[PDB]
């Protein structure tokens, strides 16, 4: 005989009056005879509805006595039973049923069906053999969709007719594992094929305390228990295992301390460490703990089962010698037929066996193993990214795929983390999708800024351009001194006067800080601003003084909108400390194109007070460590990652302006430089000026000046005099550590990183001024901490190009996305809800952390150590 019904028929022949099946209550119980007749009635009912040989029957049922009857009835009809968890989401249930496309779908309504009409004799049918399918069970798939393992009758009989089961230990077995999980194959067939009793535990999730009750009260002799759930029950309820003879514990690595609680020198209770994947039918290896001396700190998975054959193989498919690590391959009669509807994946994983019978195949587990000194097989982790969470086999790629196909998400990585309690769980790091040309929230982001500025400006009297409302330091939360704010303003005015401005347009005029000093000696001064309260204040202010009444114009409109502004009239457009309030890169690009149309030939756009994206992370680590000095290095990186994504102001890398200028042929010069002065604040440290000149300006080409590194080529300022002499005045000094950021770090308490011997950009300019040079300082594309300085013989020619030089292809992220900051905060909540409606609960990760970019290693692959903790 070579089928499950044939072997089950042999049991009922001997013991028709013995108890086969027991309910969760304990009140009801069925004999082998009663169970056989009940199963036959189901087999006739299935035949009436069209179920024949080699058909698939989906059992969408809870764990019950009726389910045990149904699987027997399915097998008696020559069919293949496929358990489906009814507590799964409908998305997953419909996915499995679609992939399976079964002959019939039974559910809870089978209980309501009247089976008394059908006969209680055998159905006979066409003759079934060993290689016909008994069941299908679905494991987690790396691609995204789940993969059903096709298991045969002789595969089940290989497991079920191991000589180890030929005794009274499995007289009363607890059936509590889910039907979808293959431990259920052990729980059902071991007692049912040896004259034992299947004690069916009640439906749903059963905690350690609830199992401990049932084990004791039902008089359970044998058990399956997952390694995690074994550890809890054996800690809190060791008194439950008094009448238990055998406990098979596995799934994950088994705790040695957990076993020592149960096992004693008398050896009435034996614990078995059961190893095996689904593809080799439940158990492939076993290690018996009879006495406590056998419990080692390594906890070996042991020796093979009767039907199994274990091969520890190297990268060239040769058998590994003793005490050497190899990958485990499982041969023998337990090896499954393959994956349902995936022939290439089957040919990949179910491979040809060089050690077994000619035709036979060998399953590739992907588990690392080693034969120890004693000759027992040890488990030494895992090759690939597969991991087990609360007993369930999880492939992270299944999670990644479900996340990746949602709207606001580009990439994803999913990893396990061990919590403070000890239990393993998942965390998914995801990066949001960045669409070009703004979103629906872009206009809403501008309106929030307008509403903020209207409320500030409306109500809340003085002179024109001499008021600085009050700017606070991000480090201390105190006010920035007005002497520093005056110098900040005067540097911008000095630069406009230096360019010899006549017809000016200031976009985002404000209270008139630049309008006050510049408009009196200007031919024309136009000013746009989207807040109507300021325009109406300024229109009253300029109305009093008749000197600048005819000159000045004040329009209330957005920076994006060009409507009504003079075309090719102005010689300079000012965007001073306004760009930061724009929603995205496309908006900034559009306003610059608008500003370019305003300029007559020869003019320039002056973009002032631009937040540097290259040093945003070093700014935010400084602010955070200043406010929270007790926090650890991991807690800082976690907090900074949130701060970057939560930033409501627009922050631009200098490469944006060079990229912007290449498409525009009219733009002949791009002058990017650091802020001037010796003031120590966030404005001077992290902001910069950009000047963009139109076609007939004729600039100084400083892009192709001969360079020299600070660390390597020219050690000190004495060497600079020598280097400037050899190169003949024209030299640009690179890789200079920025002393402004070093001062920021020591004051805020940040460790930082750079080379030795930093220079202050202002001191370098003063140093150059003494020696007859003008030093033009700018950012380094090579590093945030570094900065470049172009040294030229002194002159008043305010028209330069290529002061900032890009290095390598780096358009990875030029600007941040403040308009999407609110959607980023909603993603962790929203994605949990989305995956909970699609996937099983164990596949839904505990926490979802958002990041602007995944930390990469130098070679290219993902850097797991940099990923922030929860």
């Amino acid at each position: 005989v070579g089928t499950i019904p044939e072997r089950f028929a042999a049991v009922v022949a001997e013991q028709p009056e013995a108890v086969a099946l027991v309910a969760a209550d304990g009140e009801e119980s069925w004999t082998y005879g009663e169970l056989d007749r009940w199963a036959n009635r189901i087999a006739h009912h299935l035949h009436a509805r069209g179920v024949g040989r080699q058909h698939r029957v989906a059992l969408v049922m809870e764990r019950s006595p009726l389910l045990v009857a149904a699987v027997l009835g399915t097998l008696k009809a020559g069919a293949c039973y496929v358990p489906v968890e009814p507590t799964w989401p409908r998305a997953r249930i419909d996915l499995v049923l679609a992939d399976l496309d079964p002959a019939l779908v039974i559910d809870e309504r089978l209980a309501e069906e009247d089976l008394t009409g059908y006969p209680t004799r055998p159905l006979d049918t066409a003759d079934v053999g060993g290689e016909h399918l008994a069941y299908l069970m679905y494991t987690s798939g790396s691609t995204g969709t789940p993969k059903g393992v096709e298991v045969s009758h002789r595969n089940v009989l290989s497991l079920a007719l191991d000589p180890c089961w030929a005794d009274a230990d499995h007289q009363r077995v607890l059936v509590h594992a889910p039907p979808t999980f293959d431990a259920s194959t052990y729980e059902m067939w071991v007692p049912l094929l040896h004259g034992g009793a299947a004690v069916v535990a009640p439906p749903g999730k059963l905690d350690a305390a609830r199992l401990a009750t049932l084990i004791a009260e039902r008089g359970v002799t044998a058990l399956w228990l997952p390694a995690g759930l074994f550890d809890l029950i054996t800690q809190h309820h060791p008194k439950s295992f008094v009448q238990v003879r055998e406990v098979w514990a596995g799934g994950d690595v088994l705790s040695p301390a957990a076993v020592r609680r149960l096992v004693r020198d008398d050896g009435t209770l034996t614990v078995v460490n059961g190893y095996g994947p689904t593809e080799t039918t439940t158990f492939a290896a076993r290690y018996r703990m009879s006495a406590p001396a056998r419990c080692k700190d390594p906890l070996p998975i042991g020796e093979p089962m009767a039907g199994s054959r274990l091969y520890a193989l190297d990268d060239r498919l040769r058998q590994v010698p003793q005490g050497v690590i190899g990958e485990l391959y499982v041969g023998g009669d337990g090896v499954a037929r393959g994956y349902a509807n995936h022939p290439p994946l089957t040919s990949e994983r179910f491979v040809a066996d060089p050690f077994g019978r000619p035709g036979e195949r060998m399953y590739r587990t992907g588990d690392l193993v080693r034969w120890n000194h004693d000759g027992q097989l040890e488990f030494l982790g895992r090759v690939d990214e597969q991991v087990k969470i609360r007993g369930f086999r999880v492939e992270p790629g299944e999670i990644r795929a479900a996340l990746r196909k949602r709207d606001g998400v580009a990439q994803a990585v999913v990893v396990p983390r061990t919590d403070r309690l000890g239990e393993r769980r998942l965390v998914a790091y995801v990066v949001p999708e960045v669409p070009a040309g703004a979103d629906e929230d872009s206009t809403e982001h501008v309106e929030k800024w307008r509403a903020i500025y209207d409320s500030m400006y409306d109500e809340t009297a003085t002179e024109i351009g001499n008021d600085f409302t009050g700017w606070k330091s991000s480090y201390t939360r105190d006010n920035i001194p007005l002497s520093e704010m005056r110098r900040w303003r005067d540097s911008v005015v000095e630069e406009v006067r230096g360019l010899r401005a006549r017809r000016i347009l200031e976009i985002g005029v404000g209270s008139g800080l630049l309008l006050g000093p510049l408009a009196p000696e200007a031919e024309a001064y136009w000013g746009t601003d989207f807040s109507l309260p300021v325009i109406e204040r300024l229109e009253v202010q300029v109305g009093t003084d008749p000197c600048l009444k005819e000159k000045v114009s004040l329009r209330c409109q957005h920076a994006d909108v060009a409507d009504g502004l003079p075309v090719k009239y102005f010689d300079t457009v000012i965007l001073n400390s306004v760009v930061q309030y724009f929603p995205d890169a496309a908006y900034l690009s559009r306003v610059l194109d608008v500003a370019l149309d305003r300029l007559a030939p020869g003019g320039r756009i002056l973009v002032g007070d631009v937040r540097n994206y290259g040093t945003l992370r070093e700014f935010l680590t400084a602010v955070h460590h200043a406010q929270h000095p007790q926090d650890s290095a991991s807690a800082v990186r976690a907090a900074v990652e949130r701060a970057v994504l939560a930033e409501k102001e627009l922050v631009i890398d200098p490469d944006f302006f060079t990229e912007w200028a290449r498409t525009r042929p009219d733009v002949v010069a791009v002058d990017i430089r650091l802020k001037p002065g010796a003031d120590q604040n966030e404005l001077t440290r992290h902001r910069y000026e950009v000047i963009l000149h139109k076609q007939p300006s004729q600039p100084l080409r400083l892009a192709d000046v001969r360079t020299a590194n600070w660390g390597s080529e020219v050690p000190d300022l004495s060497g600079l005099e020598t280097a400037l002499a050899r190169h003949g005045g024209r030299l640009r000094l690179a890789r200079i550590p920025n002393a402004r950021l070093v001062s920021e770090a020591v004051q805020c308490g940040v460790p930082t990183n750079v080379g030795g011997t930093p220079l202050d950009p202002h001191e370098l300019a003063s140093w150059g001024g003494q020696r007859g040079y003008s030093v033009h300082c700018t950012w380094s594309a090579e590093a945030p901490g570094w900065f470049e300085a172009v040294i030229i013989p002194v002159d008043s020619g305010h028209c330069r190009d290529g002061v900032y030089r890009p290095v390598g292809p780096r358009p990875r992220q030029l600007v941040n996305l403040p308009a999407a900051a609110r959607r980023v905060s909603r993603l962790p909540s929203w994605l949990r809800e989305e995956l909970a409606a699609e996937l099983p609960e164990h596949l839904v990760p505990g926490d979802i952390v958002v990041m602007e970019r995944l930390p990469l290693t130098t070679n290219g692959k993902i850097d797991h150590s940099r990923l922030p903790e929860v």
Partner: protein
């Protein structure tokens, strides 16, 4: 190192059983008894592409 069955930049055969079950298999190895090579030396992508086209029916010669 990487596993030989997932090598990508590697040379492969496609073996078949007496029961017409296909198996991917690397060319350096000692070919097992009771398997014959149907797809001569090739890359992994084209070896995988062969199995999709040619296996089709996954039943182990019971009726098939």
């Amino acid at each position: 190192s990487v596993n030989p069955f997932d090598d990508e930049d590697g040379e492969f055969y496609v073996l078949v059983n007496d029961e017409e079950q296909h198996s991917l298999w690397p060319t350096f190895g000692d070919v097992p008894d009771g398997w014959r090579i149907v797809f001569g030396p090739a890359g992994r992508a084209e070896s995988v592409a062969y199995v999709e086209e040619n296996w089709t029916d996954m039943r182990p010669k019971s009726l098939r």
